[PDB]
Amino acid sequence: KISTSGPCRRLNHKGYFLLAKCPPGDSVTVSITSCTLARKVKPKFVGREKYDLPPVHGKKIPCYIYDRLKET
Amino acid sequence: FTLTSPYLGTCSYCHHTEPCFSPVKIEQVWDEADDNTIRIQTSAQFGYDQSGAASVNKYRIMSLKQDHTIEEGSMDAIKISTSGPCRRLNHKGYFLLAKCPPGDSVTVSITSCTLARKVKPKFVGREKYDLPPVHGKKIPCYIYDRLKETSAGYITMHRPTKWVFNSPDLIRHADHTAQGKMHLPFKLVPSTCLV
Amino acid sequence: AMCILGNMTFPCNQPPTCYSREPARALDILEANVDSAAYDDLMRAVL
Amino acid sequence: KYTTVVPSPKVKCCGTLECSSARHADYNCKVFGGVYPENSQMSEAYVEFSADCAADHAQAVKVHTAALKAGLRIVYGNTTSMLDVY
Amino acid sequence: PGAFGDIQATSLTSNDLIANTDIRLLKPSAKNVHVPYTQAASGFEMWK
Numbered sequence: 001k002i003s004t005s006g007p008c009r010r011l012n013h014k015g016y017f018l019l020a021k022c023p024p025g026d027s028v029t030v031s032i033t034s035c036t037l038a039r040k041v042k043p044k045f046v047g048r049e050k051y052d053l054p055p056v057h058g059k060k061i062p063c064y065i066y067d068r069l070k071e072t
Numbered sequence: 073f074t075l076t077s078p079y080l081g082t083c084s085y086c087h088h089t090e091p092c093f094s095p096v097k098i099e100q101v102w103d104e105a106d107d108n109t110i111r112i113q114t115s116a117q118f119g120y121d122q123s124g125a126a127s128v129n130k131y132r133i134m135s136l137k138q139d140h141t142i143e144e145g146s147m148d149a150i151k152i153s154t155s156g157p158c159r160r161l162n163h164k165g166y167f168l169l170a171k172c173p174p175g176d177s178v179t180v181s182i183t184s185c186t187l188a189r190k191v192k193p194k195f196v197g198r199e200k201y202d203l204p205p206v207h208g209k210k211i212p213c214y215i216y217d218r219l220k221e222t223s224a225g226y227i228t229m230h231r232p233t234k235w236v237f238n239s240p241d242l243i244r245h246a247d248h249t250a251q252g253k254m255h256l257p258f259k260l261v262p263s264t265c266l267v
Numbered sequence: 268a269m270c271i272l273g274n275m276t277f278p279c280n281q282p283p284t285c286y287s288r289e290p291a292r293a294l295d296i297l298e299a300n301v302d303s304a305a306y307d308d309l310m311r312a313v314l
Numbered sequence: 315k316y317t318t319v320v321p322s323p324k325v326k327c328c329g330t331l332e333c334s335s336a337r338h339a340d341y342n343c344k345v346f347g348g349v350y351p352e353n354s355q356m357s358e359a360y361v362e363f364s365a366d367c368a369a370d371h372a373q374a375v376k377v378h379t380a381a382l383k384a385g386l387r388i389v390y391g392n393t394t395s396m397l398d399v400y
Numbered sequence: 401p402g403a404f405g406d407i408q409a410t411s412l413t414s415n416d417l418i419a420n421t422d423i424r425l426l427k428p429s430a431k432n433v434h435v436p437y438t439q440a441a442s443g444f445e446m447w448k
Contacts (some may be wrong), residue, residue: 315442315445318421318423323435339418340420340423355428355435357428361407361419363412367412
């Protein structure tokens, strides 16, 4: 179970790594029981209007993503 | 009081990066009290447990299979929250009444859904607060009363059997118009509180 | 205090019939009397 | 506040809809074309009052010229008198 | 619309609401059935 400041949900793992989606900032913990690292995760939005969770209907401008499948 | 049937909702961000065909989806929310009380217009009926019998400890979820199969969930398992966890207070049919302190998200988990409506922080006095003070002075306010009372709001229900609600998720308003109307509970009666 | 139940008028206190005697016909009374001013009387009358 | 009636919309799968106004408030009874893959949706989110205006509303009152009462207390001799006089 | 006095009503209980609300219906685009509207804040809510 991993967490940053709230409970963070993980998505994938391959080898050493982890891919999760973690909302707030200021810490990245990894529990079972283990450590943390002090690296501030500043929150970011992509359009010209800001938001916190993604909205309902919107207009879908392009962005970048971490893919989840077997790509390097 | 479950004269009517439940429904399934099209939520956003359900326990994952998932807008999905949902269970207990919020579908409308009222934020008007002077404590942190929220009224939620859920997906599932909450009284009629064993498909005809209005009970309390169980409910009437239109379950995830696309066959209208109601499966008898235990009402001690619907956990809802907003950004931290939130204790619910009452349920009657389509409705939940809870008191949920932060904002920017209104979740209805189990794991399940949310709604990112701004639940702005509000107080009643001239000196602001977050938790209620210890001793205080009790000036008047309003409250969502949680026993029996109704609001005379007159929200309508229609056909798909039983009545089926006029929800923005739902579709079944094609030919069976001229439909009856219930009205909303939880009257929001005046009361008094501590500042 | 009268309704337009089907084609025959009835008092809203006791219109025929109750909730269990005619399901989906009491609903027809209610959907025929949406704009009735004594509508909560009809809603108490069905139950 | 309005809580706009956001009804379950009217959707024909192959037919068309031409919905005018019933005797209600602001609509936007709008009848959008080819959608949900023609099909048609006539959404009419008409406003009304909120779920509770008996508790939280306003009264835009107009005010004309005013009176004066008083509540005078007059003591004369050994007797006091409480009254009220326009 | 936008300002105080969007909805008008001669009483709470009477009929005949008269509204200019700046409600704006929007053409839906999703996989499921919903109805998207935008609006200003209620002029009562913004007067508060």
